[PDB]
Motif scaffolding. Structure first.
Motif, PDB file in Angstrom:
ATOM      1  N   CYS C 563     -73.137 -74.091 -26.797  1.00  0.00           N
ATOM      2  CA  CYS C 563     -71.777 -73.745 -27.190  1.00  0.00           C
ATOM      3  C   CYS C 563     -71.548 -73.963 -28.699  1.00  0.00           C
ATOM      4  CB  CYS C 563     -70.791 -74.531 -26.310  1.00  0.00           C
ATOM      5  SG  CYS C 563     -69.105 -73.864 -26.491  1.00  0.00           S
ATOM      6  N   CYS C 566     -73.231 -71.149 -30.865  1.00  0.00           N
ATOM      7  CA  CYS C 566     -72.643 -69.827 -30.664  1.00  0.00           C
ATOM      8  C   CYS C 566     -71.623 -69.444 -31.758  1.00  0.00           C
ATOM      9  CB  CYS C 566     -72.029 -69.812 -29.257  1.00  0.00           C
ATOM     10  SG  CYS C 566     -71.345 -68.173 -28.868  1.00  0.00           S
ATOM     11  N   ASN C 569     -67.762 -69.726 -31.380  1.00  0.00           N
ATOM     12  CA  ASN C 569     -67.182 -71.067 -31.312  1.00  0.00           C
ATOM     13  C   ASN C 569     -66.368 -71.403 -32.576  1.00  0.00           C
ATOM     14  OD1 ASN C 569     -66.691 -73.870 -30.910  1.00  0.00           O
ATOM     15  ND2 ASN C 569     -68.714 -74.356 -30.387  1.00  0.00           N
ATOM     16  N   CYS C 575     -62.690 -68.964 -24.868  1.00  0.00           N
ATOM     17  CA  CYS C 575     -63.809 -68.557 -24.009  1.00  0.00           C
ATOM     18  C   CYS C 575     -64.603 -69.698 -23.344  1.00  0.00           C
ATOM     19  CB  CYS C 575     -64.742 -67.665 -24.841  1.00  0.00           C
ATOM     20  SG  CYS C 575     -65.544 -68.616 -26.170  1.00  0.00           S
ATOM     21  N   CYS C 661     -69.011 -70.435 -19.987  1.00  0.00           N
ATOM     22  CA  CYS C 661     -68.840 -69.393 -20.993  1.00  0.00           C
ATOM     23  C   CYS C 661     -68.246 -68.126 -20.362  1.00  0.00           C
ATOM     24  CB  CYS C 661     -70.191 -69.098 -21.655  1.00  0.00           C
ATOM     25  SG  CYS C 661     -69.949 -67.863 -22.968  1.00  0.00           S
TER      26      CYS C 661
END
Ligand code: SF4
Lengths: 132, 87, 1080, 26, 171
Positions: C563, C566, C569, C575, C661
């Motif tokens: 996470c 990503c 983020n 999300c 996610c």
DNA sequence: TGTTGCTGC
DNA sequence: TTTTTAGCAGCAACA
């Protein structure tokens, strides 16, 4: 070979007598189905004579030894059959989907006679209990 | 060489059966017993062995020993089944 | 010419429906042979050649060329070709921006060369993991896909589907949805056997082979065994199951086998069906054939596979017992042919005692032939009505042949469907999950870890009946909440449940006012004593709908690391949906220092080599495999933990949180949503077809029997998508499978447990919940409660409202909706839209006439997952637990259960119902208390009889010893699958029940034999009386029946606080104390 | 004298339909 | 109540025949010349049929595993009094029935009209490799009275293959 | 009295 | 060698 079914007498009696009202036809007929084998003595004339007079459980009628094997009590649709001293059967009067017909093959004269037509049967599908 | 021959190459079942009957007659003439060595110990593949072990006298080459052992295992099971059928 | 699938009729070659597919080696090159029942034709095969392949993964994408040169030179002996490719890898950081993992595709001439490349690469992976272009090889991917499955996925060829076979490959038709009619044979076999033993193919002969082909019946008889010539006869058990049998009276067993193989070659069946023929029938035929010198493979193409199951190339082997075990939903007590025939075909087949079969071949062979054709008729119509449409429908979607589609476990069917969808989206398949050999929690060795599964409660016990009154204590504050929610709950029923607009509903305020009046009356009169409405409320496809709603897959569960890596983020991120789950460890009380002490102790011990033709007989601890080391550690830790801590295990439950996610590539959830919609599609089509099957004329034979088969077909594709969905729901905890997701499974269960506890907490405030099982609540509501209504649209159509259902669904949507669901609107620009997803609906079943719930013998404890339920007509709707339906058991208890269940429909109150039931209990107690001196002796025998079947006798039997084991040994002393029919004897007094088990066949034996064995088995040398009544343990049978009476009746009424209706069977001492403390 | 009873069959069974010959009747 | 008695010897001439509604209508018709007749081609081999004046049924006996007793009412020749046993719910005896027959089967009636498949298909495919349709239908009528789709009758051995408008039959 | 095993829901 | 999951009843042994 070939042979006719004689159904004139039953037919004439049917048209001249009223419709079947109870489980027994006006000519006095009943069937019976038991899920099992009815264990009866292999001989009867010898054994019908040792039955004491008070019980009358093995009676003699017109030279034939009949066994009194039970009693039937009909309460509406419910029916109960008492057998011997130790058996009680609970059952029901059911209307036959297919009306059964009893006939009779006279081998002697090669004649076949319609005896009667059923519409009801008394069925007992549960394990027998003592008479109490 | 006759016992170790690859019977899996023979498509003709009748010819395979005839060769197996001759080989059973040869095993009988030499008194060669097929023993199931169940010394495996783990219930998988008890190797069949010839008694007396001709293999220890004939097989001089260590490379040929491994090739012959794998071929023989399938042949000896077929030969044992035929010996049992004949018994 | 130009290839376009629209001009298929000009397209060349031949169109056909693919009935059977197998992997082959062609002049060797790997290929798949495809067998087409074909249209028009009787059949024809065609072959697709395709290179077997797998992938290498690299750790550094900048040096892939150095790995390419290395693997070209290292695999030169087996590699056909190599290619660099790109795939989506859902474990790669930022793949949601179109970043694809670079992979080396290795292709081979055949599957053997692929396996040698795997043998060469595995040592490099093991060196890299434990201890240069060799160190750039990360792993091998997709190396374990079956080759026919690979061709079926990569060419999109599916059995059950129709294809045109062309030079370019197979093209799926679309105009032909109906299956072809394959030639279907179904057979069964009758064998000789010794008394009280199983048949042995080494010594026993085949007596008869019964079979059906497309609705014609046949019987082959062996006249060495069968004493008379059997004439042609009809066995039609219903007008919808004809069976005309033509008879082949063959001189001997070898003529019988040759006739059977000849007739198979003549009719060319593409399906052979049997009942359990994988493990009896085909093994027997093949061994008898071998004794007579026939090769069954060269005669008919049939051979045993690596599993020992019987298969051919051209013909699929449809063992009906595989479908019965997996798919029929029948409990294991109803999985024998008779009980399947009764439960599916709805007739009684003929039944013969296996001990009478070999005698009846000589004494009554006509009655033995009638039995044998009955089991062929039962097997053929079981296949054609249930197995055929179900399996071929599964093949249209699953990349497997009929034999694998029948025999593989349901979680493997989910694996194949997910592999199709991952391949179609160009996703890289994960390698198969390998469970860690050991794990630790707080320095303790884990024996096992899992999650908290489905929530289950038994709240009340008793008789509940639509005609008997119940007390209700409604919470007035729950009615105030429901009155405040009512406008939006009714709007929700129009807009979400019925997918309509409120503006089209003419009577919306009428229905609102009718519900409002009933709610206000229940608020004011909140303590009532009135009739119940018995309802079941159950969540439609609960776990699948929780999974689709929350976007749950194993492709999303992200760590804080993935996470954080990503690019989506940011501050404000929506999300990252956080969800809870309850982890559950079971661990040894022993600590890491004690574990290390046990390991050091085992290093001084010596172990037997599991080696066979090998030599070294003894190993040290460190020379064992790590799995074997841990097996020995766990053994000594169980002894140590029990000695030091007085317990073997501790169990602990820890609430954990995981990140789901919403932006992650949608392939899993799209398969679930799409599959759910296609199933709904077929339910709809089903209904339209139902209308078509009744709208039209009644001339049944007027070219509309094609319409009814397709009805079965869409029903079958419906049931098929259904099993597939509920399976995805399970698959995800399929140890060893791919796409495994132990977490995800814990979230799904805890979310479900929270939904059903929320529903129960409302139902407990407005009525009385009786039982709760995972997704379902059984409850009683007041008969005055707001129930069923109809909204009227302007177009005169009526929409259905169930207020008890819609009040729950509205609260589910306000509490469990996913307002964070993200879906990819523009795949070129990676633009995501955010919407609100929820597919979690209760359905309602009922109202019901009666429900019966049993209580425990323990104080304050209900019995979960056991109940009986009746429809308004008095038919038995649903049952739980119970016996009778089981193979064997004690006949007395089966007959008692057959009588008792229908009598729960009698009586106008709950006490009246329990009194009618108690009359029947007392009658069955009188039979035992009178020592059953009544009735006939043989009948007493049967009822008292307990029957038990042994699986495989032999050494499993030299093994354990007990009652049946005692009955089987006593039959062996006196005279796999053996039916141990026995009674329990009063003598020897104080002996275990397992030593008192007498075989019933001794009572029909000669008086000297009966006397000698009864003396020896009772340990009474003086036994002169041989009446069955003085041998029987009436006390044991009275306790068995009294324990059925306690579980099914005394408990219900006494657990609900009604006096005990069968006083001749006392309550347990905890329940007596619980009643006394309830009345004080 | 009290030796009359029914040996109960656990379940109802109906046998296979059979053809009828002239000798079956007589 | 009615007392149930049994004779030591039953008459086996009495047999049970199922009477369908249509049979009942036939049975209650005095108009017919011939009412019903049992017919058979021979005594030992051929099937037995039941015929009305205009229709024919084939008879099939169906055995059952139960004890079925037919009772007829009878008037006892001499007054007979039975002892009372511990029997409950017993009304005064008013008539008497005796089980006179014990039947194990019923006679079902199925309406009926008053050669190797593979070989015949082989010979049909021979004389002509490819056959028409209306041409092949009267040629296959003889193989299975199962009442099937004609294409299924053909697919018992030969196989269909279509083209633009014609469908021929090959192998 | 509790835990633990096993079968089967 | 192939292999969905957890929660629960209850008989029987033993900590
Ligand atoms: S929560 Fe957002 S940023 Fe984090 S991994 Fe998922 S999609 Fe990427």
């Amino acid at each position: 070979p070939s042979v006719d079914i004689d159904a004139s007498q039953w037919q004439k009696l049917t048209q001249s007598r009223e419709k079947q009202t109870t489980v027994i036809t006006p000519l006095g007929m009943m069937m019976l189905e038991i899920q099992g084998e009815l264990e009866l003595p292999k001989d009867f004339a010898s054994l019908a004579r040792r039955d004491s007079p008070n019980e009358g459980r093995f009676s003699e009628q017109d030279g034939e030894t009949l066994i009194r094997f039970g009693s039937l009590q009909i309460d509406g649709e419910r029916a109960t059959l008492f057998v011997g001293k130790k058996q009680r059967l609970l059952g029901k009067v059911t209307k036959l989907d297919v009306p059964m017909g009893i006939m009779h093959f006279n081998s002697k004269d090669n004649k076949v006679e319609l005896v009667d037509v059923m519409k009801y049967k008394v069925i007992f599908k549960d394990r027998p209990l003592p008479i109490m | 060489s006759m016992i170790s021959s690859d019977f899996n190459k023979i498509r003709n079942l009748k010819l395979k059966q005839a060769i197996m009957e001759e080989l059973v007659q040869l095993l009988k003439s030499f008194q060669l017993n097929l023993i199931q060595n169940r010394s495996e110990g783990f219930d998988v593949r008890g190797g069949l062995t010839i008694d007396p072990p001709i293999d220890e006298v004939v097989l001089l080459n260590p490379k040929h020993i491994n090739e012959v052992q794998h071929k023989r295992a399938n042949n000896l099971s077929s030969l044992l089944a035929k010996i049992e059928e004949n018994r | 010419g130009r290839f376009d699938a629209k001009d298929i009729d000009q397209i060349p070659g031949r169109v056909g429906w693919l009935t059977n597919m197998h992997a082959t080696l062609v002049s060797g090159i790997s290929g798949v042979d495809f067998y087409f029942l074909d249209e028009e034709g009787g059949s024809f095969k065609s072959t697709v050649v395709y290179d077997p392949y797998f992938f290498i993964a690299c750790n550094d994408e900048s040096r892939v060329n150095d790995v390419e040169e290395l693997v070209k030179k290292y695999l030169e002996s087996c590699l056909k070709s190599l290619q660099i490719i790109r795939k989506e890898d859902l474990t790669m950081d930022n793949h949601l921006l179109g970043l694809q993992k670079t992979l080396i595709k290795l292709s081979f001439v055949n599957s053997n060369q692929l396996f040698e490349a795997r043998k060469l690469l595995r040592p490099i992976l093991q060196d890299n993991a434990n201890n240069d272009a060799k160190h750039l090889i990360e792993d091998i991917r997709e190396y374990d896909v079956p080759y026919h499955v690979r061709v079926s996925i990569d060419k999109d060829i599916r059995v059950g589907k129709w294809y045109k076979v062309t030079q370019q490959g197979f093209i799926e038709d679309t105009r032909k949805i109906a299956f072809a009619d394959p030639v279907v044979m179904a057979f069964d076999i009758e064998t000789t056997k010794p008394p009280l033993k199983f048949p042995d193919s080494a010594v026993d002969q085949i007596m008869m082979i019964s079979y059906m082909i497309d609705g014609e019946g046949f019987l082959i008889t062996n006249r060495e065994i069968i004493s008379e010539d059997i004439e042609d006869f009809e066995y039609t058990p219903k007008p919808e199951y004809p069976g005309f049998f033509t008879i082949f009276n063959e001189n001997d067993e070898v003529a019988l086998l040759q006739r059977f193989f000849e007739h198979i070659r003549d009719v060319r069946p593409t399906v052979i069906s049997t009942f359990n023929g994988d493990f009896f029938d085909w093994p027997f035929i093949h061994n008898r054939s071998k004794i007579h010198g026939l090769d069954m493979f060269d005669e008919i193409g049939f051979a045993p596979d690596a599993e020992g199951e019987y298969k051919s190339s051209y013909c699929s082997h449809m063992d009906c017992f595989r479908w019965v075990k997996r798919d029929s939903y029948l409990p294991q007590g109803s999985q024998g042919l008779k009980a399947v025939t009764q439960s599916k075909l709805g007739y009684n087949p003929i039944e013969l005692d296996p001990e009478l079969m070999t005698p009846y071949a000589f004494e009554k062979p006509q009655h033995l032939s009638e039995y044998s054709v009955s089991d062929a008729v039962a097997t053929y119509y079981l296949y054609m009505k249930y197995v055929h449409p179900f399996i071929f429908s599964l093949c249209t979607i699953i990349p497997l042949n009929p034999d694998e589609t029948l025999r593989k476990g349901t979680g493997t069917l989910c694996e194949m469907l997910l592999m199709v969808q991952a391949y179609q989206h160009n996703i890289l398949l994960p390698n198969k999950h390998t469970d860690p050999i050991e794990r630790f929690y707080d320095g303790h060795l884990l024996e096992s870890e899992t999650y908290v599964g489905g929530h289950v409660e038994s709240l009340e016990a008793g008789v509940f009946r639509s005609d008997l009154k119940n007390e209700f204590k409604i919470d007035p504050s729950a009615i105030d909440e429901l009155l405040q929610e009512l406008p939006e709950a009714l709007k929700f029923s129009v807009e979400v449940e019925n997918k309509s607009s409120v503006d089209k509903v003419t009577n919306f305020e009428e229905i609102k006012n009718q519900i409002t009046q009933k709610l206000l009356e229940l608020k004011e009169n909140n303590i009532r004593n009135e009739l119940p409405l018995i309802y079941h409320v159950d969540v439609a496809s609960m776990y699948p709908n929780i999974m689709t709603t929350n976007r749950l897959q194993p492709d999303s569960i992200k760590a804080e690391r993935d996470c954080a890596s990503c690019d989506f983020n940011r501050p404000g991120k929506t999300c990252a949906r956080k969800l809870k789950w309850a982890w559950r460890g079971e661990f040894f009380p022993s600590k890491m220092d004690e574990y290390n002490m046990i390991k050091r102790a085992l290093q001084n011990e010596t172990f037997p080599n599991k080696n066979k033709f090998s030599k070294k007989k003894v190993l040290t601890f460190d020379e064992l495999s790590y799995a074997d080391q841990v097996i020995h550690i766990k053994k000594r830790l169980t002894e140590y933990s029990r000695k030091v801590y007085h317990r073997v295990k501790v169990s602990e439950i820890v609430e954990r949180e995981a990140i789901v996610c919403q932006r992650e590539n949608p392939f899993y959830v799209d398969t679930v949503k799409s599959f759910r919609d296609r199933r709904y599609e077929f339910k709809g089509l089903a209904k339209t077809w139902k209308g078509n099957l009744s709208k039209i004329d009644p001339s049944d034979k007027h070219a509309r029997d094609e319409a009814k088969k397709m009805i079965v077909l869409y029903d079958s594709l419906q049931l098929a998508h259904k099993v597939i969905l509920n399976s995805f729901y399970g698959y995800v905890m399929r140890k060893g499978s791919r796409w495994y997701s132990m977490e995800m499974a814990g979230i799904t269960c805890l979310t479900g447990a929270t939904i059903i506890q929320m529903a129960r907490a409302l139902v407990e405030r407005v009525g009385r919940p009786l039982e709760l099982d995972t997704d379902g609540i059984w409850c009683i509501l007041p008969k005055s409660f707001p129930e069923t209504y109809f909204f009227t649209l302007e177009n005169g159509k009526k929409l259905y409202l169930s207020y008890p259902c819609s009040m729950l669904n509205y609260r589910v949507h306000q509490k469990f909706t996913n307002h964070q669901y993200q879906e990819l609107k523009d795949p070129l620009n990676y633009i995501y839209e955010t919407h609100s997803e929820n597919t979690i609906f209760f359905e309602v079943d009922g109202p019901y006439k009666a429900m019966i719930l049993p209580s425990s013998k323990e104080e304050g404890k209900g019995i979960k997952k056991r109940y009986a339920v009746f429809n308004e007509d008095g038919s038995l709707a649903e049952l739980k637990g119970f016996e009778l339906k089981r193979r064997g058991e004690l006949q007395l208890i089966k007959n008692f259960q057959s009588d008792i269940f229908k009598v729960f429909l009698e009586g106008d109150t709950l006490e009246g119902c329990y009194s009618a039931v108690a009359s029947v209990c007392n009658r069955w107690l009188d039979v035992l208390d009178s020592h059953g001196l009544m009735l006939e002796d043989e009948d007493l025998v049967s009822l008292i009889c307990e029957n038990r079947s042994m699986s495989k006798t032999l050494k499993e039997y030299e093994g354990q010893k007990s009652t049946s084991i005692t009955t089987a040994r006593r039959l062996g002393d006196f005279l796999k699958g053996l039916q141990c029919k026995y009674i329990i004897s009063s003598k020897p007094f104080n002996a275990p029940v397992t030593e008192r088990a007498i075989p019933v066949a001794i009572f029909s034996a000669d008086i000297p034999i009966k006397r000698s064995f009864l003396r020896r088995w009772t340990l009474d040398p003086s036994l002169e009386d041989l009446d069955i009544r003085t041998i029987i343990d009436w006390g044991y049978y009275r306790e068995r029946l009294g324990s059925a009476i306690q579980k099914i009746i005394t408990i219900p009424a006494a657990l609900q606080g009604v006096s005990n209706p069968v006083p001749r069977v006392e309550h347990p001492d905890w329940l007596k104390r619980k009643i006394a403390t309830k009345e004080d | 004298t009290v030796k009359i009873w029914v040996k109960y069959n656990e379940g109802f069974s109906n046998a296979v339909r059979k053809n009828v010959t002239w000798n079956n009747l007589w | 109540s009615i007392n149930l008695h049994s004779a030591p010897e039953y008459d086996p001439s009495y047999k049970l025949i199922q009477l369908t509604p249509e049979l009942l209508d036939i049975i209650q018709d005095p108009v017919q010349n011939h009412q019903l007749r049992f017919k058979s081609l021979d005594k030992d081999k051929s099937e037995v049929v039941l015929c009305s004046h205009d229709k024919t049924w084939v008879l099939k006996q169906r055995k059952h595993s139960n004890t079925v007793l037919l009772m007829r009412e009878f008037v006892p020749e001499q007054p007979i009094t039975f002892d009372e046993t511990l029997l409950f719910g017993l009304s005064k005896p008013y008539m008497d029935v005796v089980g006179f027959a014990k039947t194990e089967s019923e006679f079902e009636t199925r309406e009926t009209h008053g050669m190797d498949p593979k070989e015949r298909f082989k010979v049909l495919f021979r004389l002509q490799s490819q056959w028409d349709l209306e041409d092949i239908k009267p040629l296959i009528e003889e193989l299975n009275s199962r009442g099937m789709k004609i294409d299924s009758f053909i697919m018992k051995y030969a196989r269909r293959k279509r083209l633009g408008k014609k469908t021929v039959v090959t192998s």
